[PDB]
Structure formats: structure tokens, C-alpha cells
Amino acid sequence: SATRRYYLGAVELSWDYMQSDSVVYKKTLFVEFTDHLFNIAKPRPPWMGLLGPTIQAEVYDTVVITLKNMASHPVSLHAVGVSYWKGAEYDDQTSQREKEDDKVFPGGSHTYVWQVLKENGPMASDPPCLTYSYLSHVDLVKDLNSGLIGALLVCREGSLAKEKTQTLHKFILLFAVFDEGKSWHSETNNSLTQDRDAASARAQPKMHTVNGYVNRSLPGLIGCHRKSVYWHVIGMGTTPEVHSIFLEGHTFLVRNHRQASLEISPITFLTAQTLLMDLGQFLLFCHISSHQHDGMEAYVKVDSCPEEAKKHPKTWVHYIAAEEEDWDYAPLVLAPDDRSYKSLYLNNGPQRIGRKYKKVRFMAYTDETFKTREAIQHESGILGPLLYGEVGDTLLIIFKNQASRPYNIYPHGITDVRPLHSGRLPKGVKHLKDMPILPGEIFKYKWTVTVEDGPTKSDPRCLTRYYSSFVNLERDLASGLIGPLLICYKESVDQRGNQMMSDKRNVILFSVFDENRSWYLTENIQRFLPNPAGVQPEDPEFQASNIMHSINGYVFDSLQLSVCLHEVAYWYILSVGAQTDFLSVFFSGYTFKHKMVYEDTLTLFPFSGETVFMSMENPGLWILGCHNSDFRNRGMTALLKVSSCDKKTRHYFIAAVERLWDYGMSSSGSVPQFKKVVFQEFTDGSFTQPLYRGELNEHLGLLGPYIRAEVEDNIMVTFKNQASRPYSFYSSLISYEEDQRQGAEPRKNFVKPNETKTYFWKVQHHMAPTKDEFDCKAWAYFSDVDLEKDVHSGLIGPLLVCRTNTLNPAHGRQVTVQEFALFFTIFDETKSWYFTENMERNCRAPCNIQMEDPTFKENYRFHAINGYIMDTLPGLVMAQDQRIRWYLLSMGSNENIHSIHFSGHVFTVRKKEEYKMALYNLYPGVFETVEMLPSKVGIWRVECLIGEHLQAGMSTLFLVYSKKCQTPLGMASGHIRDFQITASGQYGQWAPKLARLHYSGSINAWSTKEPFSWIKVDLLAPMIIHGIMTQGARQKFSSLYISQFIIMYSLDGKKWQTYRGNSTGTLMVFFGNVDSSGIKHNIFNPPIIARYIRLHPTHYSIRSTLRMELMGCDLNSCSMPLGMESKAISDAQITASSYLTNMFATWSPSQARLHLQGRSNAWRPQVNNPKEWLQVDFQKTMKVTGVTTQGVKSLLTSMYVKEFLISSSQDGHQWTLFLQNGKVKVFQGNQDSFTPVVNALDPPLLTRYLRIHPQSWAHHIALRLEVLGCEAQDLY
């Protein structure tokens, strides 16, 4: 274990972005220093720029970061991906010492210790170094937008030394979107802002930047020739805004996958690897057009450095020509609907052109003179002839510009384009991509595929690329110059062109052809419109009619993809259009194999493309489209008509009961109660009595019941709508085999109010997790009547499909792993099905009801986790050292990208191989199952780090408790005072005060006479109650067994919850022994967390007499034993002043084990004096909650220390006698030799050594002690 010590410091510096180091924007950044004196800063490479110093560590390493705060605003240091103990200021219930790390005030410092453990180490199938980051978590939004961020690297064991020899040449890239408006250092005009507008200063424009440098001013990026340079990418977006980072002529490698671009969602860490096999000053630019206008571009100045079954290249002769054609977007559609949105698109008027437009389409030809067209199918539509090619293949693209405008041909994946025989390119034309081929010219191209652009072994068989004209980046695509390119792997495409066993080669283009930018715009205006003078350039309606959201160039289900049944086929999806945001492309009830993982949502970034692989077996007609509500409404749909290519019943009952749901504002002027519809499980088919939700299912919240089923476990879900609107039940897994009866009619569910419908399907392998995945895979079910509105209303629930023999048969769920499903989304109640009723009931006059007002929409917007806003989601309890399987999922609009983070925790993602991650980025429709191992006990916060998403409140608290803190809570010991105990009634003799365990006389618990007599005990603070003792009891010759009570608990004394736990019934019957004496100590599994417990006896054997004792530990679960009876500490650590070690009866300190008998059963010093001690070592700074001294009975004589002391020391020399308020606290040791006496330290002592001084004893000093406490940080 090598300790690596850094000295960080947050300093305010006048950053200047563009100008290598625009306007001088004040920024606060982490700056490393040489020593703790904080005088000299370590030199920084120029390419780092506005980025915190890199912190590197290996497995089993430890870092001691001393963070000073020289700024004028509070700063913390919250590392990600490493283990540490209590830098986040949230509710965790910890003392002042453990809250200092959460926030650091200016002029102060704190020594964080992010010890790296084996769980943080990369797996075998992972890159040698993993990319993480650290930041300031005081405010998140303002901190990130103020530049406070660094980098963190967790490499393999000893891998730093090897990296020194074979330098992997790692680059640290920060794709920051720093916005000066929402930063810690935003314009100070807010002070005395009257008559001095803050918007005059350009409204603090956001700066799309790379490492703090904008518009190609990165002065340090220098690669090496033939060098596999590694990249470490960190995204910094407070707002949910994406980026697409491209490298000129270079393709990245992430997870052994050929990423043509970097999908940089707001907060993302990834490790890339680009094999630099070329010289020149390349460009690292953002390709999405709205960000292409921005300045997120950089220089990659690669330089030379000193040195230390087709299988042949085949030519591809093609004759592509640009032809002017009148394209009909929706030719086979019916009349436009009244004056709806369809009439905006497919209708003709003074401001509307209609469905026909003048464009240019890439047309194939069978000759070099371009005088004979080929056969173009209706499926392709606007797409040109298909282009392909294995690695190392030449593509003779003979291109003729038959159209009246200069157009050319150029691929996007292939980086080697040769102009056939060496010819002189005209002046000003450096490459073949910007060649303006004049009309009639037949200039040719040759595309040689290289390994650097071909698919890898881990990648799918073919790659989804495209070819298009590049004379103008926007208008050429807007005019219909698009075509597919298939860079396939070797031994998969023959010399003819068709793929080896090309069953159904289907290409779909989810792209938007903005007809406002078509080259033939004025021609369309003066041809297809009656009076061209009526056209206004700035008319929003005229512009709106131009835009045509189309699939393959078809709008409003004009494209009918006739796919065969029982047939295996591929789908190369291409989102290359005017869209500036990702598309949640989905197939109706069709999971597709993507990244070696089955899923029913493919996220495609602009100018990208991902191939998928699905086997068609579900009959019936389906609607392929995008999850985006608006895009599907504008016409981004297609009929995936799949007809027959003619050559353990786990029953569930779900109802959409419309219940008044609040977002937890009651616990977080009246509480705004919103009416929402939610799935709900019901016991019987009449939907009268529902399944009550126990403590283990309390975390579900707004979600529906767990629809759990194993492989080949045919689910049967009966759904009856208890609502006002006709909702439905539909999950992506439902195999509608009943659609085979007729074949073509669209599926209808539309379950009317007070109507019932049955869904029955068999779970198949493709929806089950694979061998390399976890035990249970997550899905979702919702309503397909209106996906967006139904989800916004609250109809959503997880459908877990697990592997064989994973769910426990008795409980119906996997018990060995604590399953936990989460759902992140934004809930704008202005867009709910019940919005009118909710708004009337929640906001009455003088409310200013304005659906267009942004602040009004904010109030109805709720960034919630499972329906709860401010860390309110209850029911998150996990046992330490126990496997957990979180099912993270999210669904919604395009602003629904979240960065799930478990504070002080990391999780493995067995997606394709066993990968390791610490910040998962979820996309709408993506249902990913992860597994985590809880290390430290306490309260940690699950949160999304996406700026205002967390600021508005998207976060929750989960509790990790130790299953070893079962200490008595103080009932019988007298720690629980009598005034805290109250009851309602009593017996003739027994009283509520006299309820202590093993009390004097016949009194041993509480007893009562009148029925329905509850008794409650106020613990004055929430505690994890692990159970209540139940042994034999009696009184006045009345032998009585357990009284069969039911427990109610509450955190405030009002919200009384009945406990069921593992019980399927609404309550758990706490029975036990039967005569008078059997020991049936009740167990709370899962434990009860409440400030108030209450006992309600139901059975009345004799009168009510029982036997009880509260057993539980506190919130921090620090009552666990450090280990004395378990021999956790070695004999060498236990030293004594003297001992009476003998032959038969050794009296050495090594025999001080708790509850050990025999001749050698305890420790007895040679001299019985008050100055003796029993110093024990921990080898680590350990928190000591208390000391439980005990006596012993050596043969016949009974000896015990009646009173002892404590003397702590961090090294064994600085002994400190324990003192309570200045007077030595001499704990009461023992009263007999057979019963331990607990003596809690107040406050608990963190120390490496402590001494037990036996001030008083009986006969000979005897000490069978046992220390209590939990592990803590060292004092580095």
C-alpha cells in the first residue's frame, strides 16, 4: 500500500478561454502545490488548461488530499469512483467530525482520504486505467460551471511503473459547457441590480469549450506517429445537453468498439484509444450543428517522435449520379385531417407547399455514361444505392453530376479517398471531399478501406456508416443526398456485394429533411404554390410546413416495411439529418441485440448510426418510431408489418387506480396534492383487496408491482382500468401471439374505464439475461394509448425477468440479492391527463394560471426519484457485505439524460464483459441492471449529477446497516426512561412502567386486561430495531406463551405503519412458542426504522402476559463488536502490566476472550494494584463506541473487576485517562462474574490503543472484556 499525498488548493484566477494561457471570466480551479506550505505550484502541461491536477492511484493504494480553500466561496472535494468515509452536504446523521469533509469554508482546509480498494480496481476485460473525476459538491451547478473539477485515475496494481516504461500517452480532455450565468462566479451585478441590468453583459454566454480553450486554441496536444494514444474524456454539463466529438480522419476505440464519434452526454467519463497513424494538425470538433456554430473545437497536432469467404481486396464499380426528382413525402396517404398538424404538412395553401418538393436523389446506373437507371425499391425511398465494403477494399465510385447544381460523393467512415489515376485537383481544393463537380462532369473516386476504420472483433459484423455530398454540409443533405455505407468485417461480404447470407438487409434513416434549406426552395415556391408573392420568409407556419420528419423519406406511416416472420434479419439505423438531438428509436414490442445486449431502445446521436440484430417472431402490425412525443406526432413513424413469411404461470392482477399522489412535499401554502393514475397489484380477480406493500417494497413508490418471472415462465397479467380515461398495459416484452389470427390489423388495447383485459405471454430467452449478464434483467411496462402522457400521469412499472432458479420459490423473489428498482424522470404536471382537475384543485383564484409561463411550469415540474422529491423515497435499507442488484431505468423526453451516482460506492456493469463504472448515464427507454457491493455502513446519497436536476431535488438517501449491531436498546438496563414508555390501559397489577425484561418479581414484561391495549416506547431518535426478545414468561401460577402481538411503528408518532416485511399479508403475525417457555426471539427482517415502536396484542391467552426486550443499534450501525470473542485482534496486541501465567491455568492477557471458560479462561495480573492495564492494539485508528467488561469464575472462586478506566493513545505512549467534563470517568465494571456490563464511551474515542485500568475488583483482577465500535478513517 503506497500512500500518495497531494496538496490541492482552490484559487480564483482570471481565465480567458480563447486566448491561450474572449473576455476575462473569473473562474475557480483546483491547483496542485508541491508541499503543504502551499507556496509553489507544480508545473502544469499547457494542454491541461482549465482543469484540475490529475490524481493517480493503483489498487490497494491510498491518497491523502489536503484541500485548502483560498477562494471567497465554500468548496468541497467530492471524489468519484473511490472509497472513503465521512464531501457532500446532505442528510447523513453524523457527528460534527464527519460533517467537516462535506463543506470547507474559505481560509480553512481538510485532509480527505480516498483510499483505493480492490473493488475500485479494473477487471481483466477493462482498460489498464479507468477514468474518474473529482469536483466540488457544495452547490454542484455553480461549482461545475465555475470550473472546479479535476481528474482521477485508478489503474491496475503496479501498472503505474509499467506505464513509465511503455508510456501509453494518456490525454485528459474536458468537454466542458461552462456557463457564466449559472456559476459560482456569475456576474456580481445581482448585488444592487436595480437600474443596472445584468443582461447587458451578454447575459453571461455559455462557452462550449475543451479544457477551457475555445475555438481551436489547445496549445499542447501533440501525439506520436504509430502510437496508440489513450484518451480520458470528462464531460461537464449542468444542463442536459449532449455533444458529438469527432476527430479528423481518426476513429476512437472505447470498450473495444469502433466509435466514430464521442457520445458526450452532460456528465460522462470514458476511456478512448485512437491509433495515431498519420501526421498533421488534425481537428477535434463537435459535429452537432447547433454546437458546430459553437466553439468546442481543438487541435490534435500529431508529430513524429523518436522510436524505441472473400479475403482479397475487391474493387467496387458503381455509377452514382445526382438526379433532380420531384419527391413525394407522403404520396400514399389519405386526406389531411381537418385543420390538425397533418394539414400543416400534407396540404396546399398560400403558405403551404404540400407533400411534393424538388430535390436531388442519388440514383444508381448500370453504365459509365449514366444513361440507364437501376431498380430502386420503395423501401429505400430517398436513400441512394447501398454502398458496402470489407476492410481493405477499393470502391470505384464513378460519379456524374447530372443535376443542375455542383454535387460530389464522399464517404464518412472511410478515410482514404483516392482520385483514381493521379490527377491535378483544382486550386483551393485540398481534399476530394470539397470537390465542386460541375454539371456533366464524370470525375471518379476510389475508396480504400483501412483497418483503422473497420469494425473490431467486439464490434458487430458490419458498421453503420453513410456516404453523402460534402459541397455544403447542410443543404446537400437537406436536398436528399444521402446513402448507406456498410464497412463490414472480413469474411462476411463476398465479391458480388450482397452480404454473406444477407437474409433481410434493411436500412432505415431516422432523419429530418428541412425543406427550408433545400437548394430547390424558390423553385418549389414558384412551382407548387399558386401565388409565390404570398410567401413570407419569416412566416412560422410556412417554415413549419417545410420541415418533414420522415423515415427513409416517408411521413405519417407511409413506409410499410414488409418483414418476414420466423426470420432473422438486421437493421442498420441511421440518424443523419437536420435533428440536433438524440433519437430514442424503438420498435413496437421488439427487443434488438445492441452492444451484445438485448434492449428495446436504441439511442442514435446526430450524424451517427448503430446496427442492431433482432429475430422476427411476433406476428401482427407494429409502429416503428421514436419515443420522442413531438417527433412521432409530426410523422416519424413507420408500419413494421411483419406477417408470416409463407414459403409456472405467475399470475398477476394490476389495476390503474387513480389515487391522489403527492411528491413527498408533506415531509420535505398547503401541500399541493396532485391526482395521478398508477398501477397497483390486487389479490383477487374482483380487484377488491390489493396487495399491501411491505417494508421491502416501500421503495417502489410510483412504480407498479414487480412482475418477476424466470426463463420460460409464462406471465399472465389481468389488467382492469379503475380510472376515467381508457389506459392500457403494454411492456416491450409482450409477445402478442394472438395477432397471428388475422395478421395485418393494428393492435388495439384501449382498455376503457371500468373494463378488463387479459395479457398472456411466454417469457423467451432474448428477454432473459445472457450468460455474461447478471441474474435479473430489468424492463418496464407502461400504457401505449399515449406513451408520453401516460408516463407523465404515473403509469409505469418494472418487469424483472430473471435467470433459471434465481427467484426464491417461497418469497417469489431473489432473496440472496436485495433487488432495488429505481426510476428517474421529470414530472411536469401541466402535461398530465388530469391537468385541469389538478390545477383547479391545487391553485384557485387569485392564481395566475398560465401554461406558457416558465415559472408556473417550474412549480408543476418535479424532478423526482420514483415519485419523491427531496430525499424522501423510503424503503432503501441494505445489509453490509451482501449482494445488491439495482435496476436503474428512466423514460421520458430528450432532456431525460441522468448521471446516476452512488456516493462512496462503485458498481460493476456486466453488459458485454465485466466492466467497472461509477457514474452510469441513463437514456430514456434504457433499462440497465447493475450490481453493487456495500462497503461502509451509514447514510449515503444516490443522486444524478446533472446540475439543476440535482439542484431542483432529484436525489435520495439509502441506508447501509450492519447485521451485527444487535445490542439491547436499553429497555431492561434502565437506559430507556419510564416517561418514554406509555400505554392505553393496564391490568389489575401490571403497569406500563413495569415492562422491563427480567424485572423484579413476577413482573418481567407488560400485561393488560382490557382488549385493544397498545403500548408505545419513544426512543427519542430513529433506530434500526432488529427484533424484540421473546423468552418464557409467567405470573401468579399462570403459565403463558407469546401473546401474538402486531407491531406498528412511526417516525413522528402519526404515520403508523403496520409491519409485514417478508410476509405477503398486510400484517405479520408475531407468534412463537406454545406452552410457556420456548425461546422465539422475534426478528425484524427487514429491520424496522422508526422513532416510535408500538405493540398491539391480538391473541389473549390468559390475559395478555408476554416477554419483550428491544434489540437494535443506532443509525450509523457502529454498535458492532470490534472482535474479542471472535479473536479478531491477535494475542500480541493484548499486553498487560503483569500476569499470573501458569501451567494449568494461564492468566496471560491473551486469555481475555469474552465468555470463555476452563482453567485458562481470563487474565489475572501478578500484582493486584490499581495501576494495572490491559492495553490492546487495533493496527488502525478505530472508533470505540463502548466497552463491555465481564468477570470470570476460575474453578470455584468468582472474580470480577467492579470498576475500570479507559486510557487511549494513538501510538502507545500518549496515554489519556478518560475524563467526563474534567473528572476521570471511572465506568462501573461488573457486579458478578457471569454477566457483562456495557459502559458506553461518551463521546466515542478514535484511537489505535486503549488501556483498561481495574481500579476496583474482587479477590484477583479478572477481565473478560469485549470492545465495541466500528472502523473509521486514519488520522493521516
mmCIF file with all atom_site columns, C-alpha atoms in Angstrom, residues 400-481:
data_model
loop_
_atom_site.group_PDB
_atom_site.id
_atom_site.type_symbol
_atom_site.label_atom_id
_atom_site.label_alt_id
_atom_site.label_comp_id
_atom_site.label_asym_id
_atom_site.label_entity_id
_atom_site.label_seq_id
_atom_site.pdbx_PDB_ins_code
_atom_site.Cartn_x
_atom_site.Cartn_y
_atom_site.Cartn_z
_atom_site.occupancy
_atom_site.B_iso_or_equiv
_atom_site.pdbx_formal_charge
_atom_site.auth_seq_id
_atom_site.auth_comp_id
_atom_site.auth_asym_id
_atom_site.auth_atom_id
_atom_site.pdbx_PDB_model_num
ATOM 1  C CA . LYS A 1 400 ? -21.660 12.014 -62.607 1.00 0.00 ? 400 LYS A CA 1
ATOM 2  C CA . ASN A 1 401 ? -23.238 15.354 -61.696 1.00 0.00 ? 401 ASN A CA 1
ATOM 3  C CA . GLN A 1 402 ? -26.311 15.108 -63.901 1.00 0.00 ? 402 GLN A CA 1
ATOM 4  C CA . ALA A 1 403 ? -28.152 17.596 -61.693 1.00 0.00 ? 403 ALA A CA 1
ATOM 5  C CA . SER A 1 404 ? -28.082 21.325 -62.406 1.00 0.00 ? 404 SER A CA 1
ATOM 6  C CA . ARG A 1 405 ? -26.039 22.009 -59.257 1.00 0.00 ? 405 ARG A CA 1
ATOM 7  C CA . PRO A 1 406 ? -22.461 21.077 -58.280 1.00 0.00 ? 406 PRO A CA 1
ATOM 8  C CA . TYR A 1 407 ? -22.636 17.882 -56.213 1.00 0.00 ? 407 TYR A CA 1
ATOM 9  C CA . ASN A 1 408 ? -20.000 15.306 -55.286 1.00 0.00 ? 408 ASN A CA 1
ATOM 10 C CA . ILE A 1 409 ? -19.637 11.979 -53.481 1.00 0.00 ? 409 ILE A CA 1
ATOM 11 C CA . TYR A 1 410 ? -17.710 11.382 -50.260 1.00 0.00 ? 410 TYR A CA 1
ATOM 12 C CA . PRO A 1 411 ? -17.910 8.747  -47.505 1.00 0.00 ? 411 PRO A CA 1
ATOM 13 C CA . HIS A 1 412 ? -17.905 9.452  -43.781 1.00 0.00 ? 412 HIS A CA 1
ATOM 14 C CA . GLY A 1 413 ? -16.357 6.285  -42.348 1.00 0.00 ? 413 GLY A CA 1
ATOM 15 C CA . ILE A 1 414 ? -13.628 5.569  -44.886 1.00 0.00 ? 414 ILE A CA 1
ATOM 16 C CA . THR A 1 415 ? -10.686 7.957  -44.550 1.00 0.00 ? 415 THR A CA 1
ATOM 17 C CA . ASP A 1 416 ? -8.756  7.026  -47.730 1.00 0.00 ? 416 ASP A CA 1
ATOM 18 C CA . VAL A 1 417 ? -10.248 8.567  -50.883 1.00 0.00 ? 417 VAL A CA 1
ATOM 19 C CA . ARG A 1 418 ? -8.040  8.496  -53.995 1.00 0.00 ? 418 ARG A CA 1
ATOM 20 C CA . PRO A 1 419 ? -8.866  10.266 -57.299 1.00 0.00 ? 419 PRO A CA 1
ATOM 21 C CA . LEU A 1 420 ? -8.294  7.115  -59.423 1.00 0.00 ? 420 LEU A CA 1
ATOM 22 C CA . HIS A 1 421 ? -5.249  7.824  -61.631 1.00 0.00 ? 421 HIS A CA 1
ATOM 23 C CA . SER A 1 422 ? -3.241  10.658 -60.088 1.00 0.00 ? 422 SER A CA 1
ATOM 24 C CA . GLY A 1 423 ? -4.813  13.881 -61.299 1.00 0.00 ? 423 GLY A CA 1
ATOM 25 C CA . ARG A 1 424 ? -4.402  17.550 -60.506 1.00 0.00 ? 424 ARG A CA 1
ATOM 26 C CA . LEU A 1 425 ? -7.089  18.770 -58.130 1.00 0.00 ? 425 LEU A CA 1
ATOM 27 C CA . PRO A 1 426 ? -8.031  22.422 -58.785 1.00 0.00 ? 426 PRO A CA 1
ATOM 28 C CA . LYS A 1 427 ? -6.626  25.219 -56.653 1.00 0.00 ? 427 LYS A CA 1
ATOM 29 C CA . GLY A 1 428 ? -8.311  25.745 -53.300 1.00 0.00 ? 428 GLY A CA 1
ATOM 30 C CA . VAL A 1 429 ? -9.435  22.097 -53.191 1.00 0.00 ? 429 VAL A CA 1
ATOM 31 C CA . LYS A 1 430 ? -7.130  20.352 -50.722 1.00 0.00 ? 430 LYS A CA 1
ATOM 32 C CA . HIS A 1 431 ? -9.121  17.107 -50.369 1.00 0.00 ? 431 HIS A CA 1
ATOM 33 C CA . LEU A 1 432 ? -11.585 15.178 -52.510 1.00 0.00 ? 432 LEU A CA 1
ATOM 34 C CA . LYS A 1 433 ? -14.427 15.932 -50.082 1.00 0.00 ? 433 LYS A CA 1
ATOM 35 C CA . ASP A 1 434 ? -14.766 19.592 -51.139 1.00 0.00 ? 434 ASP A CA 1
ATOM 36 C CA . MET A 1 435 ? -14.522 18.989 -54.898 1.00 0.00 ? 435 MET A CA 1
ATOM 37 C CA . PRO A 1 436 ? -17.219 21.052 -56.705 1.00 0.00 ? 436 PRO A CA 1
ATOM 38 C CA . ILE A 1 437 ? -18.013 18.673 -59.567 1.00 0.00 ? 437 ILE A CA 1
ATOM 39 C CA . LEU A 1 438 ? -19.644 20.848 -62.226 1.00 0.00 ? 438 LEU A CA 1
ATOM 40 C CA . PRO A 1 439 ? -22.712 19.610 -64.159 1.00 0.00 ? 439 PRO A CA 1
ATOM 41 C CA . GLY A 1 440 ? -21.953 16.886 -66.689 1.00 0.00 ? 440 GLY A CA 1
ATOM 42 C CA . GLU A 1 441 ? -18.560 16.072 -65.170 1.00 0.00 ? 441 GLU A CA 1
ATOM 43 C CA . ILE A 1 442 ? -17.815 12.400 -64.527 1.00 0.00 ? 442 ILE A CA 1
ATOM 44 C CA . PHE A 1 443 ? -14.987 12.777 -62.010 1.00 0.00 ? 443 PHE A CA 1
ATOM 45 C CA . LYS A 1 444 ? -14.333 9.441  -60.309 1.00 0.00 ? 444 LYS A CA 1
ATOM 46 C CA . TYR A 1 445 ? -13.442 8.399  -56.767 1.00 0.00 ? 445 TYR A CA 1
ATOM 47 C CA . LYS A 1 446 ? -11.824 5.362  -55.149 1.00 0.00 ? 446 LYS A CA 1
ATOM 48 C CA . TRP A 1 447 ? -12.433 4.408  -51.508 1.00 0.00 ? 447 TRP A CA 1
ATOM 49 C CA . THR A 1 448 ? -9.859  2.089  -49.936 1.00 0.00 ? 448 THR A CA 1
ATOM 50 C CA . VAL A 1 449 ? -10.968 0.749  -46.554 1.00 0.00 ? 449 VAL A CA 1
ATOM 51 C CA . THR A 1 450 ? -8.380  0.635  -43.774 1.00 0.00 ? 450 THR A CA 1
ATOM 52 C CA . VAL A 1 451 ? -8.132  -1.287 -40.517 1.00 0.00 ? 451 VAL A CA 1
ATOM 53 C CA . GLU A 1 452 ? -8.306  1.961  -38.534 1.00 0.00 ? 452 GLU A CA 1
ATOM 54 C CA . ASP A 1 453 ? -11.878 2.444  -39.812 1.00 0.00 ? 453 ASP A CA 1
ATOM 55 C CA . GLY A 1 454 ? -13.048 -1.178 -39.994 1.00 0.00 ? 454 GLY A CA 1
ATOM 56 C CA . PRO A 1 455 ? -15.017 -2.993 -37.303 1.00 0.00 ? 455 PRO A CA 1
ATOM 57 C CA . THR A 1 456 ? -13.177 -4.647 -34.442 1.00 0.00 ? 456 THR A CA 1
ATOM 58 C CA . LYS A 1 457 ? -13.721 -8.164 -33.122 1.00 0.00 ? 457 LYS A CA 1
ATOM 59 C CA . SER A 1 458 ? -16.006 -6.939 -30.328 1.00 0.00 ? 458 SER A CA 1
ATOM 60 C CA . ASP A 1 459 ? -17.963 -4.773 -32.777 1.00 0.00 ? 459 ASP A CA 1
ATOM 61 C CA . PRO A 1 460 ? -20.903 -6.169 -34.782 1.00 0.00 ? 460 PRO A CA 1
ATOM 62 C CA . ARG A 1 461 ? -20.331 -7.755 -38.187 1.00 0.00 ? 461 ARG A CA 1
ATOM 63 C CA . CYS A 1 462 ? -20.913 -4.522 -40.137 1.00 0.00 ? 462 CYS A CA 1
ATOM 64 C CA . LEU A 1 463 ? -20.678 -0.831 -39.281 1.00 0.00 ? 463 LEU A CA 1
ATOM 65 C CA . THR A 1 464 ? -23.434 1.715  -39.900 1.00 0.00 ? 464 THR A CA 1
ATOM 66 C CA . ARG A 1 465 ? -21.791 4.491  -41.909 1.00 0.00 ? 465 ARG A CA 1
ATOM 67 C CA . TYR A 1 466 ? -23.050 6.652  -44.759 1.00 0.00 ? 466 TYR A CA 1
ATOM 68 C CA . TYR A 1 467 ? -21.978 8.492  -47.898 1.00 0.00 ? 467 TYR A CA 1
ATOM 69 C CA . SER A 1 468 ? -23.217 11.958 -48.810 1.00 0.00 ? 468 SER A CA 1
ATOM 70 C CA . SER A 1 469 ? -22.326 15.087 -50.743 1.00 0.00 ? 469 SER A CA 1
ATOM 71 C CA . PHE A 1 470 ? -19.980 17.441 -48.887 1.00 0.00 ? 470 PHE A CA 1
ATOM 72 C CA . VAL A 1 471 ? -20.049 20.566 -51.080 1.00 0.00 ? 471 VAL A CA 1
ATOM 73 C CA . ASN A 1 472 ? -22.282 22.162 -48.438 1.00 0.00 ? 472 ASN A CA 1
ATOM 74 C CA . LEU A 1 473 ? -22.713 20.335 -45.143 1.00 0.00 ? 473 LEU A CA 1
ATOM 75 C CA . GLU A 1 474 ? -26.362 21.256 -44.536 1.00 0.00 ? 474 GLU A CA 1
ATOM 76 C CA . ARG A 1 475 ? -28.138 21.993 -47.812 1.00 0.00 ? 475 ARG A CA 1
ATOM 77 C CA . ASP A 1 476 ? -26.760 18.935 -49.611 1.00 0.00 ? 476 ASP A CA 1
ATOM 78 C CA . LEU A 1 477 ? -28.329 16.650 -47.006 1.00 0.00 ? 477 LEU A CA 1
ATOM 79 C CA . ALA A 1 478 ? -31.470 18.805 -46.995 1.00 0.00 ? 478 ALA A CA 1
ATOM 80 C CA . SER A 1 479 ? -31.774 18.211 -50.755 1.00 0.00 ? 479 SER A CA 1
ATOM 81 C CA . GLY A 1 480 ? -31.784 14.418 -50.406 1.00 0.00 ? 480 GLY A CA 1
ATOM 82 C CA . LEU A 1 481 ? -28.148 13.397 -50.991 1.00 0.00 ? 481 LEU A CA 1
#
